[PDB]
Design a protein around this ligand. Structure first.
Ligand SMILES: O=C(c1cc(=O)[nH]c(=O)[nH]1)N1CCN(c2cc(Cl)c(Cl)c(Cl)c2)CC1
Ligand SMILES: O=C(c1cc(=O)[nH]c(=O)[nH]1)N1CCN(c2cc(Cl)c(Cl)c(Cl)c2)CC1
Lengths: 306, 306
């Protein structure tokens, strides 16, 4: 038992991290087979930051403008191209530690692990969720660009995020690995702001199920509600509305605890109206929304990976 | 910026995890050079659980009673011995992925990363603290025994914890890698309970410094206190007392924020007496005590590892 903010083991990703330098700018790249992927803003200088023309900046570069280092070994850049907001650097050597991988775009509310890196060197791993406003609440310092987010599905690493920038509110924005931004953000140093965030309701419910599994039961009651009555209260508190699809997703947790989803929704409705009254749930005094139903099952039932 | 519960990258440890079977019992082992380390209770059956005589149980075994698998490859056990509460299995092949390592015993209040494993397969990584009562609040299911805790110091993995059991309150207990238990626990299925826990004060202060660095300032004030006046209030709230050594440890964070430790202590004293009043600090509504001063510096300044 117990319940922690748990990330995926990062070994398979650590072997893909490289350092990319172009000019006076160094950041992180992702080396899979013979391609290194990195944010295209590595080719900007201080003059182009505010309004870069990336096609112009890239035409003015040659392969030898790009220094790629995998620890000590130097990788020779033999070609380069741009795919949306990522740069693809073709190198002379295929990464022998390339795992089975795919590129996937995730949806708001889903979680992934972040391998924070500096100078091509992995520094830490942590778990976060894609927020409904398409930002993540990450932990990143100067030099972290090109760090990646990923899930592990059996033996296969699913890359879903590459880090590009920090917004003024301290939250983070980036792209999928095909270079398409999450959210309405652009890779230029203008003043952009995230839209208003909401709480991920299906995730709060999954976490309450995790609490019941771990012996936290004080918030339960024998009332039941309907989808439409619950969604009416949720809207007032800036909670995402609950769909029948969400109810089905919560099936395994309802089955294992014998508490129906709409029963659990009645508990959540009370918590939103009366608060917690100085009581905690799984060691938190706030309702937690960064665990998916799958995260809970994985941690309260125990799937491994190859 | 930002602040997350961040673990060390686990790659260097993942390559050391093996599966150990003896009889109908399978659990995890740690393979370094030509020795596999695992909890000695792998040699118990249901009859010996309540009061095992480990010297008797071990004499009745031969090398071929122990099945060790590193994924698919079978490792041949050519010798075995007991060191306190761990079993040391000598095998025919030295682990080619052995990192630079050492065995260290940590103190209450220090943090480490846990690589939770099942059947020799790494499942997740998370960060926790050794509590003052020598337990950890882990996340572990059936089959997790032999999972290890570790820190990374530059290029060197410092192993500090091997998982042995879950106590009745849902918290976890284990040994250092020389087999000596943390706390007054024994590897037998008697009813043992952890003593009362306290809050790790120096860690709460470090976290308040992390908050200031990330722009959370609402709890500050211009009062100052003394060590002895603060410790008087802390005792009443089940907080560990604060030593001059703790003050010195917090030096770098005082320097970077320009707020003296005893100034910060005056803020903490107010938070303990008036509560949080529905305000949060770094996204928490409770005071967090599982980040050391070193964790904060590492995350709010940015050390990598080789
Ligand atoms: O390393 C960080 C960083 C990341 C983070 O998450 N937090 C943080 O404090 N610093 N940089 C800030 C973003 N920088 C940048 C540069 C250009 Cl030229 C463009 Cl065009 C754009 Cl969009 C962004 C690169 C450097
Ligand atoms: O896998 C887990 C486990 C770990 C955990 O953290 N949580 C959890 O639910 N289960 N086991 C419980 C402890 N078991 C055991 C067996 C013997 Cl024979 C002795 Cl003597 C002792 Cl001390 C302990 C081994 C199996």
């Amino acid at each position: 038992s117990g319940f922690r903010k748990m990330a995926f083991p990062s070994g398979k990703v650590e072997g893909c991290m490289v350092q990319v330098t172009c000019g006076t700018t160094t950041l992180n790249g992702l080396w899979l087979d013979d391609v290194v992927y990195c944010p295209r803003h590595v080719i900007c200088t201080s003059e182009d930051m505010l309004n870069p023309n990336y096609e112009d900046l890239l035409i003015r570069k040659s392969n030898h403008n790009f220094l790629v280092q995998a620890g000590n070994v130097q990788l020779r850049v033999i070609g380069h191209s741009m795919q949306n907001c990522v740069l693809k650097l073709k190198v002379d050597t295929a990464n022998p530690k390339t795992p089975k991988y795919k590129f996937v775009r995730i949806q708001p509310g889903q979680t992934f692990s972040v391998l924070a890196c500096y100078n091509g060197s992995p520094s830490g791993v942590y778990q976060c969720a894609m927020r409904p406003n398409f930002t993540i609440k990450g932990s990143f310092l100067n030099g972290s660009c090109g760090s990646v987010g990923f899930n592990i599905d059996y033996d296969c690493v699913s890359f879903c995020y590459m880090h590009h920038m920090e917004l003024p509110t301290g939250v983070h924005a980036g792209t999928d690995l095909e270079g398409n931004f999450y959210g309405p953000f652009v890779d230029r140093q203008t003043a952009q702001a995230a839209g208003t965030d909401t709480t991920i309701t299906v995730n709060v419910l999954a976490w309450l199920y995790a609490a019941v599994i771990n012996g936290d039961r004080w918030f339960l009651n024998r009332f039941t509600t309907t989808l439409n009555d619950f969604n009416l209260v949720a809207m007032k508190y800036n909670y995402e509305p609950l769909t029948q699809d969400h109810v089905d997703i919560l099936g395994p947790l309802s089955a294992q605890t014998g508490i129906a989803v709409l029963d659990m929704c009645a508990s959540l409705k009370e918590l939103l109206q009366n608060g917690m009254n100085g009581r905690t749930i799984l060691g938190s005094a706030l309702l937690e929304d960064e665990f998916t139903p799958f995260d809970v099952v994985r941690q309260c039932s125990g799937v491994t990976f190859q």
